[PDB]
Amino acid sequence: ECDCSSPENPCCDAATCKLRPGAQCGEGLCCEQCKFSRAGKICRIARGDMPDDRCTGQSADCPRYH
Amino acid sequence: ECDCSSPENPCCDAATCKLRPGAQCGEGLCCEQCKFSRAGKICRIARGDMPDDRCTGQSADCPRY
Numbered sequence: 549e550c551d552c553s554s555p556e557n558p559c560c561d562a563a564t565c566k567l568r569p570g571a572q573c574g575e576g577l578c579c580e581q582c583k584f585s586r587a588g589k590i591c592r593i594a595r596g597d598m599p600d601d602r603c604t605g606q607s608a609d610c611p612r613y614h
Numbered sequence: 615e616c617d618c619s620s621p622e623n624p625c626c627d628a629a630t631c632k633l634r635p636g637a638q639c640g641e642g643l644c645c646e647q648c649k650f651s652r653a654g655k656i657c658r659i660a661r662g663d664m665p666d667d668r669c670t671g672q673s674a675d676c677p678r679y
Contacts, residue, residue, distance in 0.1 A: 551678070567678055571678075572677070572678050573677075573678065576675070584677075604670050604672045604673050604677075606670050606672075606677055607670050607672075607673045607675050607677035608675065608677065609642075609673050609674065609675040611638070611639070611650075611672055611673035611674065612617070612633060612637075612638050612639065614638060614650065614672055
């Protein structure tokens, strides 16, 4: 299938709809110019006692903190 | 802003549409019963000279390696 949901997304090669050379991602709160965000970048402000969600340094999603 | 895109998803509390207690995810190739898949679980079969995509153990998406 495709690495980018949209054919407009320049993070993917138009021909293959796979990520372009160098690229690690095409979308998500932890994607920055087709690269993963640095490990520990805050990606979701938490409320109550909960810790903030942070980037993994190895994926483009913002995960629940673990 | 909900942690699950579907109201039917039992990984999320129906009242808040946030993850249920203990839950880490509700969707994705690296989610297994509302928990993250073990680090290094293969989530995408690669072709040519490329390594396979593996689960991080810290997220529910299957990332590029």
